[PDB]
Amino acid sequence: STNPPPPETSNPNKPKRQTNQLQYLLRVVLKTLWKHQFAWPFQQPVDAVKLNLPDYYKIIKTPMDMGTIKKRLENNYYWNAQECIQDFNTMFTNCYIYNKPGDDIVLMAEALEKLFLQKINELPTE
Amino acid sequence: TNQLQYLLRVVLKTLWKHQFAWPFQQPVDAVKLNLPDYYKIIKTPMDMGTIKKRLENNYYWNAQECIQDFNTMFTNCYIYNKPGDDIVLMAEALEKLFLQKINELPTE
């Protein structure tokens, strides 16, 4: 019962770009979330082997983590801020879908998402 | 038409294979699923299994009537379930992929 390959962080067929908003997402939005006390379960892809969860990747088929998002931002993977924001939402929604609304991992994800929505409201104009 | 086959051979087929599609592939059995007041609240149940069978038996007048059933399927989930719920988030993921398929709908 192994872990699948992590999501890609580069693609020669995908148009690379670098805007004012994407620079803000890497140095402001993702920066404060990465330094949060509840960030450690989300900085890497879900390790279903160490967690003894054989059913995680049987349910979640599009995993996402801050480590993937951070590496994608560093490599100019996205075309605009909307693409990067959707990866964040994917990371959050996967946690809310797989876990119970009262679990600690959900209470940690909800805290990160609220801080995420605070910094996104101050996203600069293109 | 050509759009009613695109909705069946492409749209309905790419949504049926989605990771969160299984709650929507069959009609809701509120008695089995232990969903009280579901039929009291949902007055027009809809699912991809019924939509698939209607596209195969030429039930829809045009493509917009079939799209109406997809919206009805999504709206029923947004009406009966609380926002932010797991089942709602799964329904929003299917609606997003569904709307991308509608942008690429061929012309009549």
């Binding site: 969860l53 349910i59 876990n99 679990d103 | 709650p23």
Partner: peptide, 14 residues
């Protein structure tokens, strides 16, 4: 343990 529309699995809590 979480249950959604007839499918059950073990969460991180358990």
């Amino acid at each position: 343990w979480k249950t959604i529309k007839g499918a059950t699995w073990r969460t991180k809590q358990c």
